[model samples]
Target: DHCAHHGEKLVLFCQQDGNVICWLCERSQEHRGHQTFLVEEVAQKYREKLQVALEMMRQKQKDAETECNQVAKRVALIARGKACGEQTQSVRVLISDLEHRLQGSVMELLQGVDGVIKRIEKV
Candidate 1:
């Protein structure tokens, strides 16, 4: 109805103005009436979702930290076993498992950070 006056069409999308618009509607009074929003409004409305996302991020960080510490501790154990002339297969296996877990945890944390940032616009 509105665009007919200016010989234009409306196309809903995710453009900078965040609205449906035709060529003549770009920054025109017609586009100005479109329902756009500030980020803060979106954030407030989705507070629970954002909170859950942040919590997951913190958990991932903590998990990564704990796994990193475990890797160091396992290295110490391997050293102690070697020092005592007890470099057995069990010790080697334990070290390998710890290293693999640590690597996986680190990657998980990195991936989580990416998701959290995109979801909540935060690190």
Candidate 2:
């Protein structure tokens, strides 16, 4: 935009007054010594400088969705485990399996078998 008094293109964004001006206004007492930036510089200052926040929010949104997916997968695994294990299987069978597997020296085997029998009698 052309300046009203100097007829020059608007080149300066006056930080002090928060408006656009030209080079003539830069040195004139109207905006002299006030902080001024080129239009292109201001465009980047507003646009590129805010790049981190937008991308950060985008990244955070993905994380939010990922957490939900993880919870869903965890639920699915729990359901699958319960169904498969009921068909497959342990514990009570271990006592008899251990008792039968103790076939060695008669003395050692007797103590091992005796220990299990005692455990059963106690129960």
- The TM-score of candidate 1 is 0.32
| Residue-wise C-alpha lDDT for candidate 1, range 46-103, written one tens digit per residue | 3444345545555655565565566567654666544434423433333343344334
lDDT of candidate 2 over 1-123, digit per residue (tens):
577888997766766665667798888887767898775565444333224333444455456546546666766466655544453222233333333434322222222332343333442
State every prediction's TM-score relative to the real structure: 0.32, 0.36
How does candidate 1 score on lDDT?
0.42
Please report how far candidate 2 places residue 32 from its true position, in Å: 2.3
Please list the C-alpha lDDT of all candidates, in the order they appear: 0.42, 0.51
The top-ranked prediction according to lDDT is 2
Candidate 2, residue 104: CA error in Å? 93
Model 1 weakest 10-residue run by lDDT: 105-114
